[PDB]
């Protein structure tokens, strides 16, 4: 609200959502924000219920990986070809999100231990055996 | 020049599945009371404006028929209506045998409204009382004495209450939070197939829940042509769904002028039969437009010719169906019509044009009316519609028919089109051909060339 | 994967039009433009336009802009990721110097900052712009030949004498023999009308166990010749 | 049953309602009936009257349901006093064969007339037969009420007395007769016979006399 | 063209050769992107360098892609036979479309000789029918470029009727050509015999047919 | 334009067949309805049945086992007969032109319509007894002028002596003198027979040569009596 002009491009974000096309200006928001005994009133509760267990999975994804608050974190487990021979110009500037996926929808599950104890397990006990001194 | 992987939260990531879903209504209560009981009144109202995200460049699979959204809507109509008559009064102690007597008028050339008579138990259990009423005829069938209730041997009787209504609030289907509705927005689109243009919305439209038979009435209208939806045209025993552009405009009535008598069965179950009539006694119809429902006969023949290369023979309709499936049944002002669609479905046409019709006639279908019915082919409980003070007039507009094409034999016996519901889901089948439920995963990892910062 | 399917060769009298074809499958075809390039004798390659089969829009080289039409089809979906295309080029007022082979080229990349250039090719659709007629083919075969007397090999095969319009196919049993076969190139008579040859070698004890045809198809003039090789040969080095 | 009353002013509006109302959608008739005369048809359809019936005569339509038929009369006056009749064709009910119960209409309010007697003695041919028999008009009185007392010379007669009801004519006033039987020796041996009329407050008398 | 490359360019095998593109302002490589092409005579082309640097995808890193305000550079190190032919470079920005120069033809030396092989048939039984008569002479499996073919009557030269193709490129990275002599049937009887000479810059083969026979 | 005529005996034996015609003048038998409606004294009018153009009968319930009505085709008449006839069957008879019409409340297909007859022309109406009494005539005696009032306006009659029914049509000069007559109505003489008379007032002026001759003429005693009235 009360935002024009100089604010109106805060609403074009640009990076964010710069995998190809399969997606629009409220994709990325359609799931991140849009938040008695019948049968109306049990199916609700389940999908309510629902809803925040979905959203702590994730969460706690982020916070195993020593990403909590952030939405694009970095890390320190590099790329293992084996996974993707492509490089970022022919990742980026040529598949969408929905078929990367698709992609390394094989490693993924391997990749996100890479991402729990190759790092933020190592860095969370080197930050506090250097802090010893 | 390295590559890192970096962790992404809210990419435009989903998996097709399947969840349970909630109802989302527009008015409640105070500004009109005890309004519905197909959308009830506790679900979660509708925000004032709808966010629709129209996905660019997306191409993605529908199927009305695997569909699980039907599925859910059909279960949900079903069981929304055990909750509704469980508290109310049970019609157990009108199985007692009936002496029935019909109509009183004057010689013609039978009739509909009968008048039984009957003793029940009063509220004092000892004593008990004779009553009149009068029963549609499709409600008794004889066993000195003369008739009983229909639905005594098959099941139990329960009546509704009469401060519900049966009307159909536009109700809508929202999936949770975590998922989406994705929506199909082409002009014509196909059975199941891909569609080009997708869009994603939270809820669903505005869709009337309404009960229908042979006909689909209040529903959407295609807005190009009309179409045609099978799951496979080629195979007869698979139902077809069709769709309007230009919806055709029906009227119906119950011009007889009943009244409410309220008899005395239990302890604080007053059971209310029809009274006696006032006024005219006359039938039951409905009024179509011959015009439009021929230019909408026009419009289905073409779409259907262009599906079959010799041009076929015309259908008629109606074959292996007793009660309810056969005849046009849907609700109106509170009483359950049955109508014969003969006048529809008795033409014949070949190179298009038209034949079997003669000005400006509306076209008048003689419709039965009952009160015991047991919907959705349920074994059990049936209800009892209560009986409507005054006369009963409504008003509907057609958007979809079933029809069911029939084969005989193995070959040139030719092909005509029964119109029949295959299910009773496919009344919902033909509001949600176009929406499928999917769920969002939103984290994902891809190479970038930026390393955090190193452990220090 | 994706693969682009041209429309055959052609020929047009200068004066005419002609509109070439190129159906696209194996990828979205909305996702990445489409090329027109064209290599002629007398100026190398050059480049036409692209279209945008997505939104439409077209970008024509000025030596192209007032007699080249541009168009697509809409996108037959596949999968969801896939779909089958067809874009068209019209060009118009042909004259002799136009006379060359006509490309279709995919897109490289869907953003950044070399989106449309070329990366895909079609097959090729030769255009030649003459005054004069299609004439057939004649075909005459060839005796074998002694191609190694120690080894056990010979050499036969078809010769396709004086036809105008350039493309040529040659084919063995209807394509079944496909090993050992070699085509060359066309010559350039005085006259103006062409002539190549076809050669497959075989082992010479291969005489009474397999058969061969040639199936030569000169498609600008719709004629189809099935001519069989007499095995008999006159040579001495392959009499011994 | 039989015929029910009403009275009614004259020259002002009536208003003759129907029994046995309507169940459904009526079609009601309105005969027009004297005793001895043709009945004459005011009213067809519930709001149509044929050709000749005049303008005062109107019935109510059943437009809307609820109304209930009435048959009203404007301009009363002694021509119009009738019995009327209404026919009741509704759709609940079958076949109406039987007219609807007469309603006796009667008018009241009229200016002073009085009547005209003449009195006449057996003839010569009639004491011929051995009888002789006075004859005693009474023409255009007042009221229907009157009595005729006869008087042989000034006694009362009292017997074989035979007066008639009194009976509309043609000029809406009521006529009536009245008869003396005799013998022809009582009739000469009798000075004058006096027929006298007692008509409300006056009182008329004619005297004849033997030749 | 206004685009200009090398006209040709030439290395050893496994050695190193460099390619240049360049042109006037309108096509100058300071603010215009340049793309780089192997197109075979004939075959479709394969990108190879789509941006200043970077290389097309599947392509080996042999192939390096350097520009200067003033020119622009292409390298192909460890050459191979299938190295050797033409090259085209193209000259673009995000909306405009391409530009190609003018093209360069690489040879790779340091090989290894091919010995030629040589065919010559008749003419058949049924084009002297048609009193027609043409001598086809078959070149193939050469690994040096250029050929040089040259009839003669009876061991006497011939300079009418010969039509000789220029050497085209086998798919097993060697070369083809071939060479016609048609004739009239009173030159093809009145003759001892005809021969077909394919000479080379080390060997000079001899085949000959005898009408005779 | 239809002019209806009734015609009968008047008298009727007890527990016989009385029978009537109504002759037409106006239009076709077989182009309207026609009913009869009988009169007796005391009580409403009584409604026997109908008969469409088509010649197909219906009666009423009540008197369905007795009356039998049919249309002659040649003569446009129309008979009536009474089987076993009592003395309440004593009324004044009315032979009426109906017409049909239809009411409809709804659509005509699913019938909701009903038919309703009207008689829109009455006939005169004829007028029977039946009783086992005979028939006696009716003598006429002149009425001599009072030799009456100033003006020379004078009064003379013609007197009816007892006769049996009340059924009588009396006529001056065989009724060329219309202004001034009126007959008066029958008085039920305690003899159990009726008898009325007529004046006539005339200007003394034509008292004298006036040669007045009233006609009495009555049916069910087949008697027509004219007599002269002189002073
Ligand atoms: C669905 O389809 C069905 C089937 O088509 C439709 O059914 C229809 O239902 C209605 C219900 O009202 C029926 O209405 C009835 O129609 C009759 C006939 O009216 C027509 O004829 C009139 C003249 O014809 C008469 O006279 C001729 C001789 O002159 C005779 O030969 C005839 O036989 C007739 O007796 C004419 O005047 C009418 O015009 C009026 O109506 C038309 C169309 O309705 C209008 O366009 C006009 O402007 C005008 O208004 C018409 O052409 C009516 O007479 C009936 O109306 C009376 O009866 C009602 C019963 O309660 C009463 O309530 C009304 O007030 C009305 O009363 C009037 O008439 C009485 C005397 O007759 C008076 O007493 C009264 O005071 C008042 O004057 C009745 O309306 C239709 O017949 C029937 N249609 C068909 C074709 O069967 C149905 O409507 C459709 N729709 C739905 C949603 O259900
Ligand atoms: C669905 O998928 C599609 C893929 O098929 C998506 O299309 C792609 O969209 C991407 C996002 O915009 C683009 O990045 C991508 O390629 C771009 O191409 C641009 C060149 O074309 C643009 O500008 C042209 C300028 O027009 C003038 O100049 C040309 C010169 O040839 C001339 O012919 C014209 O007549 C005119 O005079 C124009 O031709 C193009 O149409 C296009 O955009 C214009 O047109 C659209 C539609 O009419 C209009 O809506 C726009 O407002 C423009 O007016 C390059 O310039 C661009 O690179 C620049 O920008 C990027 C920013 O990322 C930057 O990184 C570069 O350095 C450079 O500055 C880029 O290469 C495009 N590809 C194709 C082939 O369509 C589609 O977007 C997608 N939809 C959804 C929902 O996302
Ligand atoms: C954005 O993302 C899209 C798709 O996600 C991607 O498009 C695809 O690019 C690839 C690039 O390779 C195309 O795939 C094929 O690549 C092979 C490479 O050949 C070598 O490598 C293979 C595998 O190692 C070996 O088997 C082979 O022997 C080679 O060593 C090409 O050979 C294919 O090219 C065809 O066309 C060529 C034209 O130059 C021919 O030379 C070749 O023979 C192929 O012929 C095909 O078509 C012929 C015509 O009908 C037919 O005769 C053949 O049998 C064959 O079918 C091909 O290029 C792939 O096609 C692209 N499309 C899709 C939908 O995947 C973009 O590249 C990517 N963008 C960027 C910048 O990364
Ligand atoms: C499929 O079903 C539909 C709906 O039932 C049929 O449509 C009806 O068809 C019937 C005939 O089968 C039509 O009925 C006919 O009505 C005519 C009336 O039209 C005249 O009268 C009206 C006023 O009442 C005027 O407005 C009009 O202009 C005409 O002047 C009758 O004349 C016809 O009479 C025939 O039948 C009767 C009764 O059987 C006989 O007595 C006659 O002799 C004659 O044979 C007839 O009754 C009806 O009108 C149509 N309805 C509609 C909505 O228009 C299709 O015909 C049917 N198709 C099939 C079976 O193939
Ligand atoms: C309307 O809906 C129809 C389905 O009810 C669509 O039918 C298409 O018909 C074609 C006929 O060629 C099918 O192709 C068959 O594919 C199967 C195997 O399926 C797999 O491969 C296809 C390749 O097209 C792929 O689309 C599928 O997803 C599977 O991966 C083969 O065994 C057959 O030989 C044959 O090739 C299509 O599968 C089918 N549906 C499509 C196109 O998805 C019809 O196209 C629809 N029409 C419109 C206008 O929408
Ligand atoms: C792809 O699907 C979208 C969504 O339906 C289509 O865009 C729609 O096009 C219609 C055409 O009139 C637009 O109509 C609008 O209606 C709204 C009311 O809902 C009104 O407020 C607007 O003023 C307008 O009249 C509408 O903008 C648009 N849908 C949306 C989001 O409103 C589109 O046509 C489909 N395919 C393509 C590519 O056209
Ligand atoms: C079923 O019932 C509906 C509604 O009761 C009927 O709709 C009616 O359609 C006619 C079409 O002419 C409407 O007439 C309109 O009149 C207005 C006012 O003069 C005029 O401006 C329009 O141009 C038009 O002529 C009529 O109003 C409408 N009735 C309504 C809205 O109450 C329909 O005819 C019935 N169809 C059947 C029996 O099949
Ligand atoms: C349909 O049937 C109903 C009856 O079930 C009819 O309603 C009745 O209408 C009459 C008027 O003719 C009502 O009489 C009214 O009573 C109220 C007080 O109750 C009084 O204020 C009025 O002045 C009048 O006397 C009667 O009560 C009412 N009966 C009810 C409502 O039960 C209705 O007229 C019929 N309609 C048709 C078109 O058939
Ligand atoms: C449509 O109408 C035709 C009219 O004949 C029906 O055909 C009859 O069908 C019955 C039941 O199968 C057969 O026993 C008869 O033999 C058929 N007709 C004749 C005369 O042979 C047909 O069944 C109807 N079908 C629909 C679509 O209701
Ligand atoms: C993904 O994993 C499944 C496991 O069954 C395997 O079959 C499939 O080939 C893999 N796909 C890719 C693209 O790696
Ligand atoms: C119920 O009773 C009716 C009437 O006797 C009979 O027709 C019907 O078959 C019975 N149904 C069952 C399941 O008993
Ligand atoms: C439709 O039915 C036919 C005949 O049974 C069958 O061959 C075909 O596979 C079916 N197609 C679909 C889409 O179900
Ligand atoms: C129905 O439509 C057809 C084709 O337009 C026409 O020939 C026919 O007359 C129409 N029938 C009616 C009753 O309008």
């Known amino acids: 609200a009360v935002g024009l002009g100089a604010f109106i491009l805060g609403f074009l974000g640009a990076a964010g959502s710069t995998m190809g096309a399969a997606s629009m200006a409220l994709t990325v928001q359609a799931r991140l924000l849009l938040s008695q005994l019948t049968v109306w009133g049990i199916k609700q509760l389940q999908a309510r219920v629902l809803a925040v267990e979905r959203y702590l999975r994730d969460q706690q994804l982020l916070g195993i990986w020593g990403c909590s608050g952030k939405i694009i974190c970095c890390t320190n487990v590099p790329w293992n070809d084996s996974w993707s021979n492509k490089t970022i110009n022919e990742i980026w500037d040529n598949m969408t999100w929905m078929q990367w996926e698709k992609e390394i929808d094989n490693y993924t599950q391997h990749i996100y231990t890479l991402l729990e104890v190759s790092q933020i397990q190592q860095e969370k006990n080197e930050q506090e055996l250097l802090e010893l001194d | 020049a390295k590559k890192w992987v970096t962790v992404y939260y809210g990419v435009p990531v989903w998996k097709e599945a399947t969840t349970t879903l909630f109802c989302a209504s527009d008015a409640k209560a105070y500004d009109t009371e005890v309004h519905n009981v197909w959308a009830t009144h506790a679900c979660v109202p509708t925000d004032p404006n709808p966010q629709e995200i129209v996905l660019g460049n997306v191409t993605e699979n529908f199927n009305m028929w695997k569909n699980n959204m039907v599925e859910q809507m059909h279960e949900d109509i079903i069981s929304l209506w055990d909750q509704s008559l469980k508290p109310c009064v049970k019609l157990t102690p009108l199985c007692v045998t009936l002496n029935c007597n019909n109509v009183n008028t004057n010689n013609t050339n039978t009739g509909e409204m009968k008048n039984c008579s009957f003793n029940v138990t009063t509220s004092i259990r000892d004593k008990i009382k004779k009553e009149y009423a009068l029963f549609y005829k499709l409600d008794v069938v004889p066993l000195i004495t003369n008739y009983r209730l229909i639905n005594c041997n098959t099941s139990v009787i329960t009546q509704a209450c009469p401060k519900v209504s049966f009307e159909p609030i536009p109700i809508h289907y929202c999936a949770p939070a975590g998922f989406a509705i994705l929506k199909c927005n082409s002009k014509t689109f196909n059975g199941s197939g891909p569609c080009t243009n997708v869009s994603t919305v939270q809820c669903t439209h505005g869709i009337r829940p309404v009960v229908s038979t042979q006909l689909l009435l209040n529903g959407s209208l295609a807005e190009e042509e009309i179409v045609i939806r099978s799951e496979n045209i080629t195979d007869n025993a698979k139902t077809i769904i069709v769709q309007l552009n230009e919806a055709v405009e029906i009227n119906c009535t119950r011009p007889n002028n009943n009244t409410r008598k309220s008899i005395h069965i239990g302890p604080g179950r007053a059971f209310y039969a029809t009274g006696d009539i006032i006024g005219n006694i006359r039938q039951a119809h409905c009024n179509i437009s011959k015009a439009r429902w021929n230019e909408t006969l026009g419009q289905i023949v073409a779409k259907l010719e262009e599906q079959f290369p010799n041009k076929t023979i015309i259908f008629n309709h109606s074959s292996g169906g007793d009660p309810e499936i056969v005849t046009h049944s849907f609700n109106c002002g509170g009483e359950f019509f049955y109508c014969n669609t003969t006048p529809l479905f008795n033409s014949t046409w070949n190179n298009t044009r038209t034949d079997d019709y003669p000005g400006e006639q509306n076209i008048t279908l003689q419709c039965r009316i009952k009160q015991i019915i047991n919907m959705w082919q349920g074994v059990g409980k049936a209800m009892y519609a209560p009986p409507i003070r005054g006369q009963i007039r409504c008003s509907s507009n057609i958007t979809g028919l079933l029809l069911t094409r029939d084969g005989g034999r193995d070959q040139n016996g030719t092909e005509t089109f029964r119109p029949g519901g295959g299910n009773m889901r496919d009344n919902w089948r033909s509001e949600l051909y176009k929406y499928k439920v999917v769920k969002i995963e939103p984290l994902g990892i891809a190479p970038t060339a930026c390393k955090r910062r190193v452990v220090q | 994967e994706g693969q682009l399917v041209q429309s055959g060769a052609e020929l047009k009298k200068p004066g005419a039009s002609v509109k070439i074809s190129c159906k696209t499958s194996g990828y979205r075809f909305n996702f990445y433009h489409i090329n027109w390039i064209r290599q002629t004798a007398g100026r190398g390659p050059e480049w036409m336009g692209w279209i945008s089969p997505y939104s439409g829009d077209k970008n024509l080289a000025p030596a192209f802009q007032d007699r080249v039409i541009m168009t697509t089809d809409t996108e037959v979906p596949v999968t969801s990721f896939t779909s089958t295309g067809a874009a068209y080029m019209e060009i118009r007022n042909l004259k002799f110097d136009d006379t060359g082979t006509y490309f279709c080229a995919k897109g490289l990349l869907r953003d950044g900052s070399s989106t449309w250039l070329p990366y895909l090719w079609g097959q090729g659709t030769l255009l030649t712009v003459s005054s004069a007629s299609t004439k057939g083919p004649s075909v005459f075969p060839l005796a074998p030949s002694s191609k190694s007397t120690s080894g056990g090999t010979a050499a036969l095969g078809c010769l396709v004498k004086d036809y105008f319009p350039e493309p040529v196919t040659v084919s063995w049993n209807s394509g079944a023999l496909t090993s050992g076969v070699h085509t060359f190139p066309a010559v350039l008579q005085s006259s103006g009308l062409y002539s190549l040859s076809s050669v497959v070698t075989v082992p010479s004890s291969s005489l009474g166990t397999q058969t061969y045809i040639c199936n030569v198809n000169h498609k600008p003039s719709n004629t189809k010749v099935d001519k069989r090789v007499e095995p008999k040969s006159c040579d001495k080095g392959l009499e011994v | 049953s039989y015929v029910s009353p009403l009275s009614v002013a004259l020259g002002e509006t009536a208003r003759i309602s129907c029994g046995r109302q309507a169940l459904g959608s009526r079609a009601v008739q309105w005969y027009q009936h004297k005793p001895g005369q043709a009945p004459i048809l005011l009213i067809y359809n519930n709001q149509d009257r044929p050709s000749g019936i005049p303008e005062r005569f109107s019935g109510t339509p059943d437009i809307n349901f609820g109304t209930t038929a009435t048959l009203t009369i404007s301009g009363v006056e002694v021509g119009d006093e009738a019995d009327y009749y209404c026919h009741m064709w509704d759709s609940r009910s079958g076949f109406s064969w039987s007219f609807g119960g007469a309603t006796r209409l009667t008018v009241l309010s009229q200016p002073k007339a009085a009547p005209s007697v003449t009195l006449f003695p057996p003839s010569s041919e009639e004491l011929q037969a051995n009888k002789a028999t006075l004859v005693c008009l009474i023409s255009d009185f007042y009221p229907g009420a009157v009595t005729v007392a006869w008087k042989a010379d000034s006694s009362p007669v009292k017997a074989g007395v035979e007066t008639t009801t009194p009976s509309k004519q043609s000029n809406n006033k009521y006529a009536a007769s009245s008869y003396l039987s005799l013998t022809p020796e009582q009739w000469k041996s009798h000075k004058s016979y006096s027929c006298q009329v007692t008509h409300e407050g006056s009182t008329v008398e004619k005297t004849v006399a033997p030749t | 063209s206004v685009l200009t490359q090398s006209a040709s360019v030439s290395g050893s095998l496994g050695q190193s050769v460099t390619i240049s593109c360049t042109g006037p302002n309108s096509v100058c490589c300071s603010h215009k992107s340049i793309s780089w092409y192997q197109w075979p005579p004939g075959r479709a082309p394969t990108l190879i360098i789509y941006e200043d640097n970077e290389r097309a995808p599947g392509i080996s890193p042999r192939f390096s892609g350097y520009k200067s305000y003033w020119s622009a550079y292409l390298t192909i190190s460890d050459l191979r036979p299938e190295d050797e032919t033409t090259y085209y470079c193209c000259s673009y920005t995000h909306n405009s479309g391409c530009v190609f120069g003018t093209g360069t033809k690489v040879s790779v030396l340091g090989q290894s000789k091919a010995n030629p092989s040589v065919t010559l048939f008749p003419p058949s039984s049924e084009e002297l029918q048609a009193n027609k008569a043409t001598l086809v002479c078959l070149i193939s499996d050469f690994y040096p470029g250029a050929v040089t073919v040259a009839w003669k009557a009876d061991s006497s030269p011939v300079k009418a009727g010969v039509e000789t193709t220029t050497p085209s490129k086998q798919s097993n990275n060697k070369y083809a050509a071939s060479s016609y002599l048609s004739l009239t049937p009173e030159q093809w009887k009145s003759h001892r015999s005809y021969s077909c000479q394919v000479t080379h810059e080390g060997s000079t083969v001899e085949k000959t047919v005898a009408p005779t026979e | 334009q239809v002019q209806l005529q009734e015609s009968g005996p008047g008298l009727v034996r007890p527990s016989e067949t009385l029978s009537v015609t109504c002759i037409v003048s106006?239009?076709?038998?077989?182009?309207?309805?026609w009913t009869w409606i009988r009169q007796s004294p005391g009580k409403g009018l009584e409604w026997i049945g109908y008969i469409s153009d088509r010649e197909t009968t219906t009666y009423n319930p009540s008197l369905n086992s007795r009356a039998v009505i049919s249309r002659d085709t040649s003569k446009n008449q129309l008979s009536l007969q009474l089987r076993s006839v009592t003395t309440a069957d004593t009324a004044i008879y009315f032979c009426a032109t109906a017409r049909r019409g239809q009411r409809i409340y709804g659509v005509v297909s699913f019938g909701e319509f009903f038919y309703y007859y009207y008689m829109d022309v009455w006939g005169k109406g004829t007028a029977v007894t039946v009783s086992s009494a005979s028939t006696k005539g009716p003598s006429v005696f002149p009425l001599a002028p009072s030799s009456s009032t100033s003006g020379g306006t004078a009064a003379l009659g013609c007197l009816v002596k007892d006769y049996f029914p009340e059924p009588v049509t009396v006529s001056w000069n065989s009724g060329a003198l219309t202004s001034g007559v009126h007959t008066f109505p029958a008085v039920l003489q305690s003899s159990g027979l009726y008898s009325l008379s007529s004046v006539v007032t005339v200007p003394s002026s034509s008292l004298g040569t006036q040669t007045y001759i009233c006609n009495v003429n009555h049916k069910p005693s087949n008697t027509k009596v004219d007599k002269k009235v002189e002073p």
């Open positions: 106006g239009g076709s038998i077989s182009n309207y309805y």
